[PDB]
Amino acid sequence: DLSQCDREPIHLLGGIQSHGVLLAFRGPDRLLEVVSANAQALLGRPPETLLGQPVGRVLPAEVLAQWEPLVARGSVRVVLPAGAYRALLHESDGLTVLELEPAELQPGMEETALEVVRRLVSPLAGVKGTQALLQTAADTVRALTGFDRVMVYRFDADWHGEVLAESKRGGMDGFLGMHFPATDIPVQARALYTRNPLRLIADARARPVPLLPPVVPALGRPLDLSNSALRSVSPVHLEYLRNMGVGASFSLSLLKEGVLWGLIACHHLEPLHISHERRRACEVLTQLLALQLSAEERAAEASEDAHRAALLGQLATAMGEGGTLEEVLEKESERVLALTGAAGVALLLGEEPLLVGCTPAQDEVEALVAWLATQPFQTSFHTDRLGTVYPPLAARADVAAGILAVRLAPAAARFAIWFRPEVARTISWAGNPRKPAEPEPGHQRLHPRGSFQAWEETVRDTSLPWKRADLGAAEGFRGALV
Amino acid sequence: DLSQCDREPIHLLGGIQSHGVLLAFRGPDRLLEVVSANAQALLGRPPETLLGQPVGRVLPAEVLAQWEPLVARGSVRVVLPAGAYRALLHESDGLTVLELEPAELQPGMEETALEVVRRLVSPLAGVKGTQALLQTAADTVRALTGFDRVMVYRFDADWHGEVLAESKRGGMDGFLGMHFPATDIPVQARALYTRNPLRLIADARARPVPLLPPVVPALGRPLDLSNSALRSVSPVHLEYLRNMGVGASFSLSLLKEGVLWGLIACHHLEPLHISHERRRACEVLTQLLALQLSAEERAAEASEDAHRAALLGQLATAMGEGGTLEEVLEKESERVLALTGAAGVALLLGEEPLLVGCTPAQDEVEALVAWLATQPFQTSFHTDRLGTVYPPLAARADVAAGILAVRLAPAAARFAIWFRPEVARTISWAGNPRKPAEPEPGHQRLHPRGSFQAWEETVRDTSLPWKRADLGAAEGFRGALV
Numbered sequence: 032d033l034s035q036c037d038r039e040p041i042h043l044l045g046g047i048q049s050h051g052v053l054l055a056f057r058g059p060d061r062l063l064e065v066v067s068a069n070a071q072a073l074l075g076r077p078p079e080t081l082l083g084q085p086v087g088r089v090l091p092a093e094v095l096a097q098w099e100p101l102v103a104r105g106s107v108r109v110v111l112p113a114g115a116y117r118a119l120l121h122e123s124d125g126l127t128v129l130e131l132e133p134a135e136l137q138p139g140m141e142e143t144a145l146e147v148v149r150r151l152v153s154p155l156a157g158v159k160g161t162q163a164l165l166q167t168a169a170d171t172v173r174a175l176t177g178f179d180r181v182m183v184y185r186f187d188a189d190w191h192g193e194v195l196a197e198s199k200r201g202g203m204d205g206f207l208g209m210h211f212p213a214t215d216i217p218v219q220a221r222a223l224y225t226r227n228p229l230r231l232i233a234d235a236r237a238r239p240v241p242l243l244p245p246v247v248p249a250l251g252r253p254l255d256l257s258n259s260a261l262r263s264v265s266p267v268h269l270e271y272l273r274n275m276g277v278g279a280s281f282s283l284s285l286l287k288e289g290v291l292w293g294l295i296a297c298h299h300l301e302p303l304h305i306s307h308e309r310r311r312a313c314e315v316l317t318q319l320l321a322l323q324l325s326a327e328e329r330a331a332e333a334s335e336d337a338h339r340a341a342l343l344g345q346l347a348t349a350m351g352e353g354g355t356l357e358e359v360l361e362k363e364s365e366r367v368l369a370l371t372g373a374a375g376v377a378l379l380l381g382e383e384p385l386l387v388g389c390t391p392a393q394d395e396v397e398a399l400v401a402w403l404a405t406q407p408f409q410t411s412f413h414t415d416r417l418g419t420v421y422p423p424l425a426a427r428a429d430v431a432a433g434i435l436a437v438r439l440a441p442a443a444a445r446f447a448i449w450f451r452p453e454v455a456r457t458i459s460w461a462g463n464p465r466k467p468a469e470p471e472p473g474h475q476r477l478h479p480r481g482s483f484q485a486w487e488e489t490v491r492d493t494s495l496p497w498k499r500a501d502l503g504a505a506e507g508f509r510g511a512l513v
Numbered sequence: 514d515l516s517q518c519d520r521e522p523i524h525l526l527g528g529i530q531s532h533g534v535l536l537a538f539r540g541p542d543r544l545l546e547v548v549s550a551n552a553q554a555l556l557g558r559p560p561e562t563l564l565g566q567p568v569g570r571v572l573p574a575e576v577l578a579q580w581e582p583l584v585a586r587g588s589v590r591v592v593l594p595a596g597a598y599r600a601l602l603h604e605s606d607g608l609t610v611l612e613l614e615p616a617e618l619q620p621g622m623e624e625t626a627l628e629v630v631r632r633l634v635s636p637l638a639g640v641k642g643t644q645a646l647l648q649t650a651a652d653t654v655r656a657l658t659g660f661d662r663v664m665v666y667r668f669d670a671d672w673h674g675e676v677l678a679e680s681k682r683g684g685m686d687g688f689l690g691m692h693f694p695a696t697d698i699p700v701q702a703r704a705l706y707t708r709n710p711l712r713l714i715a716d717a718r719a720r721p722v723p724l725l726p727p728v729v730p731a732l733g734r735p736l737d738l739s740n741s742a743l744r745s746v747s748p749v750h751l752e753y754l755r756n757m758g759v760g761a762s763f764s765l766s767l768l769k770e771g772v773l774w775g776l777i778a779c780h781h782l783e784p785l786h787i788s789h790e791r792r793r794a795c796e797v798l799t800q801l802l803a804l805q806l807s808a809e810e811r812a813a814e815a816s817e818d819a820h821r822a823a824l825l826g827q828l829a830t831a832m833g834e835g836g837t838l839e840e841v842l843e844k845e846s847e848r849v850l851a852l853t854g855a856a857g858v859a860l861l862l863g864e865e866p867l868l869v870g871c872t873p874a875q876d877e878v879e880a881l882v883a884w885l886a887t888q889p890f891q892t893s894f895h896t897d898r899l900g901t902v903y904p905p906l907a908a909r910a911d912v913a914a915g916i917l918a919v920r921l922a923p924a925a926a927r928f929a930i931w932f933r934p935e936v937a938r939t940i941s942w943a944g945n946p947r948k949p950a951e952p953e954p955g956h957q958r959l960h961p962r963g964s965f966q967a968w969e970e971t972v973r974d975t976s977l978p979w980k981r982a983d984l985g986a987a988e989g990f991r992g993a994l995v
């Protein structure tokens with residue numbers, strides 16, 4: 032179900048944010064084709080009068096002088112009689128898009144940000160866990176942006192997420208540890224956040240500035256603002272902000288090894304514009320954490336596969352120390368369990384089933400033993416909520432909430448099945464997950480949930496997720512029984 | 514220790530660089546105890562008549578106006594009539610040492626180094642290899658320092674180095690590809706370089722400034738200048754550079770997982786001083802490179818593991834469904850070799866040897882098995898130069914230069930032994946390695962080597978080195994068959 036949320040084009044709403052001015056040109060003569068209605072407060076004259084006119088007679092000479100560097104570097108600073116603006120330049124719908132927004136005024140900013148990078152690299156980060164690695168990356172970003180609250184938000188495989196870190200001001204509420212639906216950040220949004228990694232909402236109460244003309248004439252549609260720094264956002268999202276009593280919003284995507292792993296959302300309770308220069312420096316921090324997270328993770332996985340392979344070697348040094356099948360896998364009982372972080376093992380070596388640890392009844396292992404043999408897997412099968420696919424043992428989630436089965440022979444149903452009990456998790460949801468929006472009668476005008484107060488849900492009948500190492504240790508064992 | 518170049522106390526040389534003043538204070542009354550003889554250059558009044566004078570009456574009020582900002586940070590900018598300077602504070606031998614140094618004049622340093630941090634931390638970096646990673650880092654440090662040549666030095670196991678990357682200006686001598694002896698950077702300096710990661714020589718030809726008094730009166734020795742920016746390097750080094758044609762040297766240790774991976778060296782043909790702050794943003798980049806290298810490198814070891822584990826996966830699917838062990842290893846001999854990237858394998862299941870691929874003859878293999886039997890290895894043995902420990906097959910480096918053996922049995926003689934042939938290398942040195950230093954009659958006066966021209970050499974009887982992924986799969990094979 033691709034809902035109403037996952038529909039309307041957020042890149043075709045046709046408004047810009049009032050703290051800036053948008054101009055679009057087409058042609059070798061670069062005649063103004065698309066103008067935002069507030070254009071006058073800079074250009075001088077009625078916007079309607081400057082459509083159809085080449086750049087030379089609409090743009091100030093303060094800016095055209097630096098047009099070449101604008102074209103080559105994509106952005107240049109320009110001082111006007113109004114103040115210091117930053118000219119941004121890109122391409123869209125075959126037209127040239129120009130944006131003026133206020134520039135950075137405080138000149139020891141890059142110095143300051145060069146010092147938050149030293150903190151986020153250091154000799155080495157992630158000392159006592161990646162938790163304080165995200166907590167620093169949150170602190171650094173608050174210190175640089177001046178925002179009252181900064182959360183690290185992670186995405187889960189269902190595309191729901193959780194605040195894993197939070198650096199806020201004293202006397203402020205916090206969303207630490209809470210959980211959030213997938214409809215909160217829809218799919219079309221996550222599609223373009225994985226392309227354009229920044230977004231600033233200076234004033235959520237403010238009214239978007241329309242563009243002129245309302246369509247691109249040669250197209251019958253509005254100008255594609257997917258790469259605009261001043262594009263104004265969906266209306267139903269400005270209300271979700273107001274129902275949190277926030278006033279400004281800045282978010283950066285956390286792209287690590289290709290995918291959208293999460294966001295760094297920044298909340299302020301009064302409007303605040305952050306210079307495009309200050310946001311690029313923040314982007315330098317977010318990429319920094321994303322590289323730290325990657326090197327820490329692989330290192331954990333490597334060390335987690337060296338201890339598992341220490342076990343595989345102890346199994347074999349013993350299994351060859353004496354002819355003793357039934358006996359060693361019994362005398363070395365905890366070295367098999369710990370191979371997959373398991374609590375009971377059922378080994379199908381024909382004959383009878385050698386039951387080790389806490390394990391389901393011999394006539395119940397013989398029940399999944401017969402169903403698994405008619406399941407579509409090749410070498411391994413792992414469920415973390417078995418009861419849902421195999422309900423007969425849905426009441427035995429005390430020993431069989433999750434399973435990890437390996438085939439010890441091609442045909443000839445010969446398996447090694449590790450078992451895990453459930454692990455009960457209470458997740459707190461920021462507001463009711465079942466009514467996470469308010470539709471109006473006719474179900475054609477959705478609104479957001481107005482309460483983000485805790486909602487608690489103990490999760491049952493699920494086990495711990497089978498990590499990557501458990502699974503490799505399983506198939507390593509497999510090449511030692513055949 | 515081993516040689517004289519290791520004896521030299523390169524931290525008690527009593528000299529500093531003429532582009533700066535050093536002053537050391539001690540006591541509740543910050544009495545001046547040690548001072549550089551050039552201190553009168555920037556203080557006014559001869560350095561001898563201010564010794565034992567409170568800090569108040571010796572320093573300029575321009576410097577003392579920031580005396581509290583100076584302490585709690587350890588760095589600050591002051592404007593003397595002599596010019597803008599950087600004051601830096603640190604404690605050595607119960608003394609408060611303060612070092613005055615010309616400060617940075619180009620104000621967009623921090624904006625420039627941000628852009629170069631952006632380049633080296635961006636994702637998609639290392640995509641054409643880690644060669645492009647060091648090449649990017651050498652090109653970026655050159656853009657900030659402005660040196661005429663910036664090279665990447667990697668120490669090997671034996672502490673000699675080579676140049677794996679290089680970035681230089683048009684028409685200049687390079688050292689790409691070349692190898693440099695262990696004696697060129699001696700052990701007492703490596704140790705120090707693990708702890709102070711940035712050093713700078715501004716005039717390879719300027720003579721040191723003495724410190725007055727020649728000693729610290731309470732010790733009998735001079736001031737320890739371990740954590741010093743203005744310290745003068747040993748005179749044996751100064752000759753080295755002046756026989757190299759360099760006029761200024763600046764280097765940054767590449768500390769990787771806490772150990773000294775290598776060094777980024779930069780050469781200018783003329784004297785050049787880099788500001789303290791610019792040396793600290795270059796060191797930012799050394800830690801991005803250290804990070805980037807650690808992450809990439811962990812990604813490959815994993816991808817290596819996956820291939821081997823699959824090779825272990827298919828053999829054990831060959832096993833348990835096709836006759837004896839002498840047959841399935843006859844139809845997967847291309848996998849049993851590939852396990853350890855081997856040219857041949859000799860398995861000993863207790864029968865006569867079963868030789869696979871390119872091996873030495875049955876008798877040569879048999880003889881080695883009875884040799885290794887005495888040897889004191891637990892479950893694994895490996896060498897890249899067998900002939901150095903077992904000469905009987907020192908003629909056979911065409912098949913047996915390097916070997917990897919695993920014990921397939923407890924207190925018994927059952928092994929699987931993979932075989933590699935030699936891989937002739939070719940080390941092109943910067944000078945003849947047997948003449949690394951040229952002493953005078955008597956040997957209490959050493960002189961740098963005079964000629965840095967390519968001295969080629971071709972190492973033989975040496976195989977490709979048994980890596981982590983190979984060894985890991987060697988033990989995997991051990992745990993599979995009986």
Ligand SMILES: */C=C/C1=C(C)C(=O)N/C1=C\C1=NC(=C\c2[nH]c(/C=C3\NC(=O)C(C=C)=C3C)c(C)c2CCC(=O)O)/C(CCC(=O)O)=C1C
Binds near residue numbers: 214272281294468478
């Ligand atoms: C049916 C529609 C929607 C419901 C219901 C809902 O809750 N959101 C809906 C649509 C959109 N959400 C968009 C963006 C967006 N959502 C989040 C998540 C949060 N945003 C916040 O402001 C907070 C807290 C205050 C949270 C937890 C984020 C981070 C974003 C990105 C924008 C930002 O950084 O503020 C969205 C797209 C907006 C656009 O056009 O840019 C839509 C349509």
Ligand SMILES: */C=C/C1=C(C)C(=O)N/C1=C\C1=NC(=C\c2[nH]c(/C=C3\NC(=O)C(C=C)=C3C)c(C)c2CCC(=O)O)/C(CCC(=O)O)=C1C
Binds near residue numbers: 693714745750753762
């Ligand atoms: C017996 C003495 C020595 C011989 C012979 C020799 O070749 N070196 C000897 C001693 C020391 N070398 C020290 C420092 C140093 N050496 C290198 C290596 C190079 N420096 C270069 O300039 C080049 C190329 C021209 C190479 C290959 C480096 C990088 C360093 C560090 C200093 C720098 O980067 O400029 C040394 C340390 C002296 C000190 O630090 O006080 C000694 C004693």
